[PDB]
Structures are given as structure tokens and as C-alpha cells.
Design a protein around this ligand. Sequence first.
Ligand code: JK2
Length: 332
Amino acid sequence: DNQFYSVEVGDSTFTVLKRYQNLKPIGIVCAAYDAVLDRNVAIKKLSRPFQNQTHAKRAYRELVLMKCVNHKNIISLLNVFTPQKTLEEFQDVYLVMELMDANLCQVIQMELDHERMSYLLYQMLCGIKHLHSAGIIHRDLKPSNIVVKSDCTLKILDFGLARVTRYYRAPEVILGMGYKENVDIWSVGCIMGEMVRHKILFPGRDYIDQWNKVIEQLGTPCPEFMKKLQPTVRNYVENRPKYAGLTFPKLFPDSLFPADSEHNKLKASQARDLLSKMLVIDPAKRISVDDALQHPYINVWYPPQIYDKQLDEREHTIEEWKELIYKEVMNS
Ligand SMILES: COc1cc(NC(=O)c2cccc(-n3ncc4cc(Nc5ccccc5F)ccc43)c2)cc(OC)c1OC
């Protein structure tokens, strides 16, 4: 009541505890100063996350995982609150975490630096490894939901898909082929390659021109792969102009890298090598997390909890989702 005040942020209103002051905008996220803690924080507003059964299962899963998956490269919450006083009146959820400096999208725009790039990839792989260890296969990693401080410490912000822009999604996901752990490796590869090219690797104009930009560059998969494709998806892909692709030196030429020293030549070779092992259409030929972590480009950088599967299985009425979420917000 008198514990809260409201402030316009973009097109919306943030109603937050009075400890959170001087909200500035950075879906809906602001930077604030926490007066009690004497620290800067980031505050995210989930507005009516029970909009439907889909907004709801995600919001609930996300909220539960943020308080049970604990790892330095994974989001951890400082606080969770709602300004509403009762289940009946309940509408908004506010999540509060440490304020970081930038997300990977900005980092990608910086000139290429091997030490920094291999450092960011190391941490990303470590986060993912721990996620896999905690029973989470993500499938939806993207530069916009990965954040960093200026000392280049990194955090993944969300927990991915249940169970138009798909630039970072693995081929087995785009074609509905079912998946394993190394599905997240493709996304890391997309991100690595973007840090080198300073441009999105596979900028499809539609969720089907996306497939085109992948094969144009990497080549048509071997036929063995197209078998795992459903009858209707297999038809499209199989009966389609074959592409040879480019070799990895040509996808990522010398000119994109530091040079003029053998160390810089060594580093460009290692990076392309790693790239060629992650950007592999066929998941059965794609490198694993453990292997990527042992890779020369990466390895120079040196327990989880029992996953509740009902977290994904159980579907609910909108009314019950609301009550599950509310209950989670109230157990600070
Ligand atoms: C002027 O405002 C300041 C902004 C800055 N850093 C920026 O601008 C910046 C850029 C990109 C990303 C982030 N950043 N940090 C945390 C963060 C969290 C989310 N999402 C989210 C939040 C809570 C719970 C779950 C969530 F998924 C989204 C973006 C985020 C900040 C630094 C500052 O100083 C350290 C600022 O001055 C106070």
C-alpha cells in the first residue's frame, strides 16, 4: 500500500517497493537503486504472466528455476514481489537481480579480442553445462538474454523452451527433429561466429528462408540426416537444390582476425576449428559441451538438484496457474 509507489517506464507503469529508487529503463526492465542494500539492481516486470496457459507455464517454470538452479553463470534473484495484496487482486510480478553492464549484443559489436571471446565462450559453456546437469536443455539461447559486467563476467538470464526470429535455433529444432544436449552447442556457435563477423550468421527473412541461409553457407546435409525428418518436412528439404557451402576459412576469412604474429595465426586457426565443430547441422556430428570445454581455444580457462519434471508435464487451468504463481511469489 504505502510500501509502494508508481513510475512510468516507457509505455508502462512500474509499481515497486519504495526501497527501489530512480528507475531508468534499460521484456520490461529498469535499472534502479536499492536504498536498503545501497546497491544498483535490475528490475523486470512480468505483466499478467497468466495471460494464457502458455505465458503462464513459462512464467512459473522460470520463477521456480531462478531459485533452485544456482551457478555463477546463471541468473540469481535478489528479490521477488507483487504490489497486489490478495490472490483475487493479483496481477503483476516483479523480479529483482544484480544490475549488469551490457548484454552480448553490444559485446558482439566490439572489435575482435581472442582473450575476451574465449573467456565469454568459456563461461557460456559452463553455464550451459550446469543447466544440462540440472536437467534443463535450453534450445533458445540468444545474445539478447545473456548479460555481462565490464570485467567480462557473464550470466544467462532465462531457461529456454518448454518440454519469426529463429536466428540462433538449431536445425533439429527448426525441423522438429527432437534433440539432445548438444542442441545448445549450435547456438553458442552462432554467437561465436557473430562475434567474428559482427553480423548475424543466418538472418532468415522467414522461418523457412532461415533454413536456406544455413545450407547456403554450411552445405546441404548428407542424406543420412534427412531420414530422421518427418514425411512432410523430409519432402521439402530432400527435394531441394543441393548446396556445397563454403569451407570454414572462407566463411570466416583471415581478414576478420588479428594477424601479423604467429600467436594471432594460431588463435585464428583454433577459433575456426572450434567454429567448424559447433556449426554442424547434423547433431550426431556436432561437438558436445564437455568436448567444447576441452578445446584448445577454450581450455586455457581451466552439485545440481533433482529436477521436478512436473515442471514441464503438468498443464493447468488459467485460474490454477495464477494461484501457483502467486504462491511462489509469496514465498520469498
Ligand atoms: C543508467 O543505467 C545503468 C545501466 C547499466 N547497464 C545497462 O544499461 C544494461 C544493459 C544490458 C543489460 C542489462 N541488464 N542487467 C541485468 C539485466 C536483467 C535483465 N532481465 C531480468 C531482470 C530481472 C530478472 C530476470 C530477468 F530476466 C535485462 C537486462 C539486464 C543492463 C549499468 C549502470 O551502472 C552500473 C546504470 O546506471 C545506474
